Amino acid sequence: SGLRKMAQPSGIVEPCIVRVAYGSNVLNGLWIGDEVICPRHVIASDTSRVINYDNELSSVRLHNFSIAKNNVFLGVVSAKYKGVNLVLKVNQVNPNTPAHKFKSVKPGESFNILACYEGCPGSVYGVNMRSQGTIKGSFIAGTCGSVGYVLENGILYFVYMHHLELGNGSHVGSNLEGEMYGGYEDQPSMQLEGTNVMSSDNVVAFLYAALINGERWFVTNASMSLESYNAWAKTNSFTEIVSTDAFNMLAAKTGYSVEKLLECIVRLNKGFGGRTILSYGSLCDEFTPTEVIRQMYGVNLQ
Amino acid sequence: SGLRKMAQPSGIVEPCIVRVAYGSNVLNGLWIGDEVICPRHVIASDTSRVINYDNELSSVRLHNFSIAKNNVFLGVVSAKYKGVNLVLKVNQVNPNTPAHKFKSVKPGESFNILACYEGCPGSVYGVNMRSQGTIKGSFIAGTCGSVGYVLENGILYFVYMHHLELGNGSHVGSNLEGEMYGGYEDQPSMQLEGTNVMSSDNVVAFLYAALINGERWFVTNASMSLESYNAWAKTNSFTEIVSTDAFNMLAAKTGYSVEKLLECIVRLNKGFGGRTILSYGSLCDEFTPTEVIRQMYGVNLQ
Ligand SMILES: *C(=N)[C@H](C[C@@H]1CCNC1=O)NC(=O)[C@@H]1C[C@@H](C(F)(F)F)CN1C(=O)[C@@H](NC(=O)OC)C(C)(C)C
Ligand SMILES: *C(=N)[C@H](C[C@@H]1CCNC1=O)NC(=O)[C@@H]1C[C@@H](C(F)(F)F)CN1C(=O)[C@@H](NC(=O)OC)C(C)(C)C
C-alpha cells in the first residue's frame, strides 16, 4: 500500500552530466557522444537585459569554455545553436554514452528530473508537464542544464533541459531539439503562464489509487458519461478523457467504472469538506495511470 | 524556487540489486562483495502463521535459491542470520561493488529508497524515518529487500532494507546489520505502532522553506522561546529542540528567528483553516534542515 511521487532510476543518466562554465557563468551540460548540450544563455554576457543571441554566438571564444567531469576537462572544437540550446562538439567521446532517443513530453505526462548543481548530480525526482508547458519543480541558480528523462519499454528518452524560472515560480525548459516548452523565450522579459488545466486522466488514476489502498468515502452509486464530463471539463479548467481503455486494469481490480469516478471529480471539485483522499486535501493530478499501476501492482515499470 | 521531496542519485546502488527467489517467495537482495543480503522471511514456508526461523535455516536447501542479475546467476555457498537478515555467501564477487559503510538512521532523518520489484530497480524516492521506527513509503508484494541509502560526505551508507507493512499501512525495515527499526519482529503478528511524534526540527525547516519561497500568511509578530516551546512539545507529540544552531543560515538570510517559527508551529498545529503552506494542508515534518538548505542554496548536496 501507499502512494508516493517517484522517479525512475537515474544511474544511466548520471555519467552524462558535465559542468559547463563560460566567463562568470556556471551550469550543467549533457555529454553524449562527442557533443555537450547546455542552455545557450551560458554565453550571454548579461542575463539581466534582453539578449542578442546572434551577437553572442559570433563573439564566442571556444577556448574560454570550461567543461569538466571529475577533473576530466574537454576541449570545445565547434559551437552552434540548436534552438535555445548550444551544441558543443568536444574533443572526446563520452565513454559512458547510453543508448538513447529524444522525444517531447506532452501535458499531463510525467518524467524524471536529475537535478544537477554546477555539474554535480544532486537529486532526482518525478515531475509532470503542465498544460502551459511548465513544471513545478525545485530549481535555483546553477541548475540550468539539468536534464529530464523517461524510460519506456527499456529505452532512455531525453525530454527536458532546464532554462529558467518564471515570475510566478513556474519552471521552464526545452526539449533536446531546443524547442522551449510552452513557447517561452530564454529572455529576462516578463512572461506569463496561462490558466493551468488539470489532467482528468491523472485525477481518475489518483482516485483509483485511493480505492486500491482502501479509501472509499468519496464514492457512491452515481456515474457520468465521458461526453457529459468532457462538456463540464471544458468550462472547469479540466482536460477531456479520450478513452477508459487506460483504466481497464484499475477498473477490473477495484470493480469501479471510470464514469463513476468522473462523477466523483465534479462532486469533489467543489470541496473535500475538510476530508482527505490519501492525505491530500484536494484533487491531485500529479499521478498518471501508468504511475499508479506501477506502484500498486508493479507492472510495466518502463 | 520550489520545494520537492527528492532522492539522492541512485546510480551507485543500482548495480548491487539482485533477484532472490526461494520456493514460491521472490524478492530483492543486495549483492555486495561475495555476499547477498535479503530479508530472512524469504525462506519462510508460510507467512500467514508464526515462523520458526531456527527450524527454517536448519531445513534450508541452498540449491533451492535462485539469485540472478540479468544473465548472471549466483550460487549460494552458505547462509547465516544477521539479525532479521539472511546473509548468503555466493560464489562470485560483485564486480560493481561500491565503496560503502553501514549505519542506522535516527528518527527525523531522511534517506533514499531504491524501490526494486523482484530484482528489477524500479524507482527512487526520498523518505523520512518516523519516531516509531516506521516510514510511510509505497511498498507492495515483491519489493522486500529494497534498500535505503544515504550519501554523506562522499560516503555511501546502506541504512535500510524493507521487510513488511503493518496493519495501519506503516512500512517496516531493518538496517543492514539486521536490527529491525522500531523493534518490530519479522513475524505476521498484528503488531501495533505507537503515537507518531513530529520532528520539530524538520517542521521549522519546512516553515523556513515556505518563507524563502514567498509564503507569509501564517506569520505574526509573536515569538516563543525554546523553553516554552519545548514544554509545549512534551505534551503535543512534537520533539524537543535542543539547539537553534542548525538554522543559523536559514534564520540569517530569511530574517526570521527560530523562536518566531516555534510560535507558528504551536498555532498552526491546530489546523491551517483551509489554507496551504507550500501546497501542504498541514504541518510537514518530512524535510530536514539539511534537505531544505540543499534545495534552496545547493550546498552540502551529500
Ligand atoms: C539557470 N541556472 C537559471 C535557473 C533559475 C535561477 C532561479 N530559478 C531558476 O530556475 N536560469 C536563468 O538564470 C535564466 C537565464 C536568463 C534568461 F532566461 F536567459 F533570460 C534568466 N533566467 C531566469 O531564470 C530569470 N527568469 C526569467 O527570465 O523570466 C523571464 C530569473 C528567474 C529572473 C533568474
Ligand atoms: C515483501 N516483499 C513484503 C512487502 C509487503 C507486501 C505488502 N506491503 C508490504 O510492504 N513483505 C512481506 O510480505 C512480509 C513478510 C512476512 C513477515 F513479515 F515475515 F511475517 C509478512 N509480511 C508482511 O508484510 C505482512 N505484514 C505484517 O506481517 O505485519 C507485521 C502483510 C502486509 C500483512 C503481508
Author numbering:
A (entry chain B), B (entry chain A): 1 to 302
Reproduce passages from the article.
Coronaviral Mpro is a 3C-like cysteine protease that cleaves the viral polyproteins (pp1a and pp1ab) at evolutionarily conserved sites to release non-structural proteins which are essential for viral replication and transcription in host cells. In this study, we present crystal structures of Mpro from the feline coronavirus strain FECV-UU23 in complex with four clinically relevant inhibitors: GC376, PF-00835231, nirmatrelvir, and ibuzatrelvir. Our structural findings reveal that the active site of UU23 Mpro maintained conserved catalytic residues in addition to distinct, lineage-specific structural plasticity, especially in the loops forming the substrate binding subsites.
The most recent clinical Mpro inhibitor ibuzatrelvir is an analog of nirmatrelvir with the bicyclic P2 moiety replaced with a more flexible ring, which we co-crystallized with UU23 Mpro. As with nirmatrelvir and other irreversible covalent inhibitors, ibuzatrelvir’s nitrile warhead bound covalently to the C144 residue (thiol group) of UU23 Mpro. The conserved P1 lactam ring of the inhibitor established the same hydrogen bond network in the S1 pocket, including with the side chain of E165 and backbone carbonyl of F139. The distinct feature of ibuzatrelvir is the trifluoromethyl proline derivative at the P2 position, which made extensive hydrophobic vdW interactions with H41, D186, Q187, and P188. The tert-butyl P3 moiety was able to establish hydrogen bonds and extensive vdW interactions with E165 and L164. The CH3 moiety of P4 methyl carbamate in ibuzatrelvir was sterically accommodated in the pocket by the proximal residues L166, P188, S189, and Q191 (≤−1.5 kcal/mol) that shape the S4 pocket. The weakened affinity of ibuzatrelvir to Mpro from UU23 versus SARS-CoV-2 (reported < 20 nM) might be due to the less favorable hydrophobicity (S2 subsite) and complementarity (S4 subsite).
